[PDB]
Design a protein around this ligand. Structure first.
Ligand SMILES: [Zn+2]
Length: 323
C-alpha cells in the first residue's frame, strides 16, 4: 500500500534566490499577455456559443505552440440545465500525464450568459478572461523551465466550462464543468494500472484563480489545509516587493493578507474540496465592484496588478515544482 498520496503533506518548496527572482520578474510580459492571450478571450463565450468554441481554440493553440510537452484533452459531456440538455467542454492541459502527482492551476473559461443590453455584451474580463490569460502567460513565460520536466510531480492546467449559472446560482445550475470533472477524476485510477488511488489522490493542490484583474484585490486565507501555501504567496509577494520587482505596490495594500474567511464561496473548487482535495482559492474578497455587470470589461482592468500577480504566481509554481 504506497503512501505516495501523502507526499503532498510534506512537500516543501525550493525557494528562489534574489537573482532567480529578478529573472522571473523580467521573463514575463504583461503587454504580450494582453495582446496575445487576453484580448482574443474578451468575447461573449457562454457554454455552447460560437465564442465558447473560439475561446477553446485560442486556449488550445496558445498552449500547442509552446515547447514543453503539454498533452491537451477536451472533456465533453452533457448536463441538464434550465434550458434543457446541453453540451459542455472542459479543457485540460497536462505535463507528464502519468506522473503520479500534479500541481493544478485552474480557472473557468465560460462567460456568464446575458442578453445583449443596450448593445452591450458581457465579456467577464476579470471573470475569468484574465485568469485564463494569466495561466497562458505562465505556460509561455516558464516554457523553457517546464520543458525540463519532459518528486514524481508535474503541472496541470484546467479551464472549466460552465462555472456560471445560466440563471442565478443554484446547486443544479452552476459548476457544470467542475462537478463533472471532479466526479470523473475521482473515479479514474491513477497512475494508470493503479488498484486503489484516483486522479484526485494525485492532485497535490488545486490553485483556482477567479475574479482577478480589478484594483486592490485582497485574497483571504480560506483553508487550514493549504494555509502554509498561502503563507508562501505572502512571502513571495513580500520578497518581490522588497526587491523592487513589483509595480505600484505597497505592503499596506498587499494582496495576500493575514485573514481567514469562514463562509463558503461557491466556485469550481467546491466539488474538489468536498472530495478532500487541498485548495488554494485565489478569489478576492470583496469581489470586484464590476462583478456580473457589463462594466467587467478591459477598460476596468488594472494592468500593473495583473503583472504583479503573474510574477508572484510564476514564482510560486517554480518553487513548488523545484524548477
Ligand atoms: Zn461570474
Amino acid at each position: 500500500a504506497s503512501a505516495w498520496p501523502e507526499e503532498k503533506n510534506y512537500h516543501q518548496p525550493a525557494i528562489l534566490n534574489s537573482s532567480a527572482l529578478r529573472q522571473i520578474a523580467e521573463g514575463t510580459s504583461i503587454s504580450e499577455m494582453w495582446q496575445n492571450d487576453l484580448q482574443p478571450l474578451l468575447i461573449e463565450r457562454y457554454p455552447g456559443s460560437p465564442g465558447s468554441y473560439a475561446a477553446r481554440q485560442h486556449i488550445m493553440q496558445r498552449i500547442q505552440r509552446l515547447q514543453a510537452d503539454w498533452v491537451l484533452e477536451i472533456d465533453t459531456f452533457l448536463s441538464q440545465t434550465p434550458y434543457g440538455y446541453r453540451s459542455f467542454s472542459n479543457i485540460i492541459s497536462t505535463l507528464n500525464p502519468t506522473a503520479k502527482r500534479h500541481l493544478v492551476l485552474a480557472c473557468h473559461y465560460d462567460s456568464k450568459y446575458f442578453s445583449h443590453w443596450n448593445n452591450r455584451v458581457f465579456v467577464g474580463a476579470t471573470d475569468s478572461a484574465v485568469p485564463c490569460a494569466m495561466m497562458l502567460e505562465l505556460a509561455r513565460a516558464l516554457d523553457k523551465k517546464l520543458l525540463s520536466l519532459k518528486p514524481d510531480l508535474s503541472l496541470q492546467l484546467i479551464f472549466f466550462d460552465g462555472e456560471e449559472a445560466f440563471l442565478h446560482f443554484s446547486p443544479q445550475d452552476s459548476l457544470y464543468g467542475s462537478r463533472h470533472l471532479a466526479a470523473k477524476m475521482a473515479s479514474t485510477p491513477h497512475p494508470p494500472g493503479a488498484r486503489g488511488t484516483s486522479q484526485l489522490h494525485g492532485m497535490d493542490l488545486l490553485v483556482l484563480l477567479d475574479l482577478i484583474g480589478a484594483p486592490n484585490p485582497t485574497f483571504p486565507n480560506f483553508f487550514p489545509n493549504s494555509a502554509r501555501w498561502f503563507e508562501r504567496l505572502q512571502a513571495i509577494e513580500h520578497e518581490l516587493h522588497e526587491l523592487g520587482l513589483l509595480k505600484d505596490h505597497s505592503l499596506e495594500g498587499r494582496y495576500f493578507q493575514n485573514y481567514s474567511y469562514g463562509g463558503v464561496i461557491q466556485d469550481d473548487h467546491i466539488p474538489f474540496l468536498r472530495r478532500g482535495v487541498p485548495v488554494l482559492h485565489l478569489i478576492p474578497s470583496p469581489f470586484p465592484e464590476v462583478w456580473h455587470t457589463m462594466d467587467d470589461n478591459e477598460e476596468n482592468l488594472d494592468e500593473s496588478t495583473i503583472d504583479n500577480l503573474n510574477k508572484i504566481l510564476q514564482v510560486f509554481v517554480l518553487e513548488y515544482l523545484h524548477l
